[PDB]
Amino acid sequence: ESQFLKEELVAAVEDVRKQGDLMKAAAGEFADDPCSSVKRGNMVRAARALLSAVTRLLILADMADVYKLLVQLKVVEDGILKLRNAGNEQDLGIQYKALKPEVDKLNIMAAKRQQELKDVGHRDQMAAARGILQKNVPILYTASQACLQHPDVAAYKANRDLIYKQLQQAVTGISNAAQATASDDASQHQGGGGGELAYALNNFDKQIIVDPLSFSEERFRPSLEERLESIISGAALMADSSCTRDDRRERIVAECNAVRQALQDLLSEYMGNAGRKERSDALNSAIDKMTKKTRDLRRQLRKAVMDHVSDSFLETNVPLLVLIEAAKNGNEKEVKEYAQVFREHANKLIEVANLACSISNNEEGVKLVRMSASQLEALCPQVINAALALAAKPQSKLAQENMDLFKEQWEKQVRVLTDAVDDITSIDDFLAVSENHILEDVNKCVIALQEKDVDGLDRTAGAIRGRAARVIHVVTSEMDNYEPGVYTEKVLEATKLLSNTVMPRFTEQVEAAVEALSSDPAQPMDENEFIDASRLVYDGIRDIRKAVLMIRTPEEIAGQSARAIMAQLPQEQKAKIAEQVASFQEEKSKLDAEVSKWDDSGNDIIVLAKQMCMIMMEMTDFTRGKGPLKNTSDVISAAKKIAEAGSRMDKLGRTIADHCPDSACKQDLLAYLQRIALYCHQLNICSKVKAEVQNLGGELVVSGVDSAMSLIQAAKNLMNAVVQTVKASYVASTKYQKSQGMASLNLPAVSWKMKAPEKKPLVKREKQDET
Template sequence: MSGDIYVKYNPKDAQVKTWSVHRTLEPLVTQVTTLISEQPSNKKKGRSKRAHLLVSSVIKATENFISKAIEIANENPDMKNDLFASMEDVKAAGDQMAVLSKDFADDPCSKGKRQQMIAAAKVLLTSVTHLLILADLVDVQLILKSIRLVEDDLQQIRDASNQEELIHYYKQYGKDIIDLSNHAHRRQYDLVDRLEQEKLAQARGTIKRTSVMLLTASKAYIRHPEITFARENRDYVYNQLRDAVNTISSITQGKPVPNAQNIKESMSAVGDLTRALNEFDKIVVMKPTKFNEQLIRPQLEERLESIISGAALLADSLSTRDDRRDRIVQECNAVRQALQELLDEYIQHSRKKSSDEDVNRKIQSMQNKTRDLRKQLRKAVIDHVSDTFLATNVPLLALIDAARRGNQALVEENARIFMEHASKLVEVANVACSMSDQAEGIKLVRLAALQIQNLSPQVVNAARVLAVRSTSKVAQENMEVFRDSWEKHVRLLTEAVDEITTIEDFLAVSETHILEDINRCIQAMVERDADRVDRTAGAIRGRSGRVIDVVTAEMEKYEPGEYTASVMDKVKTLRDQIMPSFADGIKQAIDALCMKPAREPDENDVIEASRLVYDGIRDVRNAVLMNPELEWPSDEEDGLGDEIYAPSQASSHGPSSDSVREDVEIYPGKNDNPSRDMMRRLPKEEREQIELQVEGFKKTKRDFDREVLKWDDKGNDIIVLAKKMCMIMMEMTDFTRGRGPLRTTMDVIHAAKMISECGTKLNKLAKDIAAQCAESQSKADLVAYVDRITLYCHQLDITSKVKADVQNISGELIVSGLDSATSLITAAKNLMNAVVLTVKASYIASTKYRNKSGNKEPIVQWKMRMPEKKPLVLVDRPNESTRIRKGAMRKRLEPMQVLSEFHN
């Protein structure tokens, strides 16, 4: 075994690298700086310490440092001489500081004595800092000893010639690597530099991830040394571990990690397209007086063409849908046109032919066009993500199956497919990064993609080893370990990509893709192509599973509540009811097509099952979009006009695709009724009036939340009905603003009917409570409020029906759009007020004025809702803004900064 490593302290390097040294040095720095400070004390009068007390505190702290250093020196003979030499310096500086500070305390107005004491304080702090850094080197020596042991273990494992030696050395390696990991873990959290912390964490993760692979790869090589692929597997794992250990060694000794800064910048850089669009949005905004056409126009046009070139590459990719490609082209042309109009407006302003308001209007139009282009580019990225991350383990399973059968030719073919798939994963991950501005998320994606890029060839090598020795147990174990590692990295990459893509874009694109797959599945059913039916049905199940996983992961980010409960209820329905029913229907259809002679499958059952899948996906998406922070898309964006083909059954032998399109049933429906998107097309003045009405409704909603949400709805049907009515009223109000799950006026009518039904139930409950209430003013109030609910439910029902009738007759919204919208909002606001008053009166009537003569059980239970759980420890989240009280903020004194501020 090699000798121990000893790191010599460099007196010129006085950099404090750990928080332990910071925290130990901080009290002394505070005491010394308080003693020598010329600024008045911030403490209240009468509470400031005397100079003599501060002097004694400094002397005592110095003595404590020396006594602790003596203990450390006695426990570590290797550094005893250096520690004792540093202690002598501290003691000399402390004695000098004690003498001069006492003189200053006796005569605090003497400027000369103050200057002498400041010089002595600088020498004392510098010597104490050196002593603490030397003490910190003791921990460094322990880590370096552990590193040397692990390096020796790795070399012995590499040189092992048989299985017995390998197992013996690996057991010793296991003990030493645990010791090193513990030391590195403590060091990681003690380091001041954030980049060093990240690199140390990455090295520890590599060691943990590849240690098992080291054993299996080494076993496979020792057992089959004639196979070069086994050597490549072993060398890959060995090099990974060696580099990780070297990283820990470099960071521990304070040496720079090679290319660490460049890696950090490249990994966490904002996406190219996003950065280019952000910069373009900034530079188009300028003072009109500073516009120089000869200089600025070529620059802006060149930047825009560079952005459009990047957008064109994304649009021309294979996974980008044709309609998405057309939309990107349209938006690029619109941005070009908007830029020319803005430049012309700048020129007109320079000629005094336009105002600042006209220029600002063109700037706003320019930024709106770039925003629309961003939206289409993001959806094009989701096209790629949705297709590529659909069945990530299928190529791997095919490769492993071929290897287990010992078919080397098939292994090579599947290896090519697997490597193409891995390259596609990395490519799509980088494409997703190009349209993201989340620096931390981008770094995770690129690190995961880099791991997959490095691991992919080794997975293929493990499969080749297994193909040559398909009956070898060590080859099978090696393959399983590489398979597990690959799948873990792919899951990590998938989660990281999901983090940097917005869920509303993902759900919109997934819904469109599922609709495409459903149409292909039905068309394949008509053409009696069992294989294509199976493939497309598998794609539908895979995309639905992805939607379920992504939405479930998204809901875990929220505090449990009504919103998350509603979303998860839709997810559960899709996962536990709709998808099993769809799978059974497809299985029956495929079995019927595969029978000899073929039996006619029930196409209507398949179509109905497909409709339920589409409805389930749309319901999940609508539930997710109920989050007020997310924007509802227009009907044109979310594919309201898309169709599920329901082919005619007139032809029993399978019509052509053209005949399929001639006889279709449109789903979810043509716009026989005006959709919510028409509400967005109202004139600006009318929309502003609607917003005024909505503001009044929001105020009522706040009163509702304050009064109703404080009660637990378990055992209280009044609160349950009130919450349900409130949710429906919010949806109806959102409809008037062109958003929300209600799409047509017929949906509004159905919502009004649901409110009426809830109002009837609430009416009955309230009257039952009133019947148990003693004669009082509270009972009279409750009866009056119940009558209001009946009245306003009837008014809301009539308002929604009149609105639909007028629109159906006229075909345009301009006749009564504003009046009907404001009437709807007013009726909803009045009803919500009545519900709030009814809840208050019901509580008083059922708890304060109950008729004591009867022994009836209370109709509802009034219990306060439990407050939401809060974490005991607040975790710092860099991407979230946190409100911090000023009183809670403490300024950390950086010791080296304080030293630099001293003056001789």
């Protein structure tokens, strides 16, 4: 009605008008006498009162918009119910016409709010709820229509009420997201882990460095043994899954026992380091072996997910085409039989997607997958309901139309999910696994030929065609994310040659082999051409992979130096590093802003922070191929230089913590010193992993950049741990006391002097907090 809602708005415009005047005058008097102290304060005083008036206006105006949205919502709500309860195709057509515009208005208003919502989690939630409503309003029409023509088909009634229950859910979803408030901030350190197993594993990597002998960790925290069993129970779901390879099952099992035995050897060593004076070198080595075994298990889980994407995401619409054919031939029992096959495969698809989510630290990507999965789950029974309807009336024109509507809808939604799962998995890993499975399947295909097994030939060729088609699709779509040029050309020629030349010849050879083995007695067949055409599928895929990973020198310790090859890395690999180095620069700029307000003369901690910041950046510039480190011999010495400086900073941090009487402030500082020791150890293990090189065609290639990815990740983590130390080191030094016990020091070693008030580094510290 907006009788009071838009009445307060008029009054709010007056205050903005009044304050605006008072501002103009105070602003004027200041401009004429700008050296005036008082006239200036009056103009600030004015600007503040102007700001309150303006914000109270904009806030009030935004409430007005929310209300307006909720009224449009109740309109579309009653519309959908009126559409559902329509009794004649007349009264139905009337409603749909009156409603369609009301849906569009609502959609626009919804889009607007979506933008004003700060909570990024809800912005995608609103977009989902809008899109669902947008899509099903027409479907509900066609559905509740059919129910009016064939009133005795329970299959239609069920399907209609399903789309309606879906729509009403979306309407509430819109309402729910529309009222999300107010200001949120997602953590960058520590955060954010989308996967429950991904989070658990990363959390455990932080708990191992802390001493569990203490009464603040034994009687007060869940034991490392309990935490690890929560990981193992998660890794168990991955290994015991139906879609998991028996070869991979035994790898996770082996890694779980390996990560378990690595903890017992660490727990027995924490008893040995009870003195905690000089940190045991036997203990530091036990922490290193522990942090390595967590990494190894993580990598096994990654590949375990990759095997699922390779095996379950090929020829996905096959059960549906079979179910639809049984529905077309009006076989009332065959549909019900193929419906349970179709539902089981959809459940397998969902399972593979959820597994992929569990190990992904891509919070955003994981949400899209889970959203896409839940939509597939809701769509599945609706597809089955359309098939059952067609099975009862295979001649009915509407049953043929509805089936086709859900036929293209299911294919579309399976596509949305597979692309979402492709986004949370590495293309490199996918290609390496695809290649391994193609080789295996082509080998099985040729053995089927030699064993005169027509069944095996057709089923192995089906898996090859499906996997080969999926590779072309994942690579083509990935090529869209890159600037067209020399790189994207070769990668697309390779994909076209596979799909347009290699795959068609392979298909023809399979066809001919099956044909020549079907007619009795076994007719002549050129096994040479068959073997050659199969060998080509593997060669085709291997070349696509060769192109995606192609390390080239220009644009228009074998081979070169470790930093030169890093600069020459493929545009695909060069992108992932640039993203991680940018994420590191974010944490690097935080240190520079902190270390600049301090004066060192005087202070060793802030000197060690700068020295570490320097060497830390050389290692990230080596992965960029622009660093002064020429070989892995320079990188290992750089990881040792930060380890020496990280230990010197650990020494100075413990002394300030010892002189600190307040155990609350002391507790924070010592924790960030444990963080430094962990990421110091994690950077030395990242310098040990060599950037391996592979090739078959001749031209050398680097498969995966996870070894370099983890070095930037451990550096960014150390950069955050050092800034939070320098910060806490000062807070503890303000509580500093006259030592009369151990260690004796009346005057502190490090002097916390503030830098002189300077014009230019002050205007740069504001621009750092503004961005």
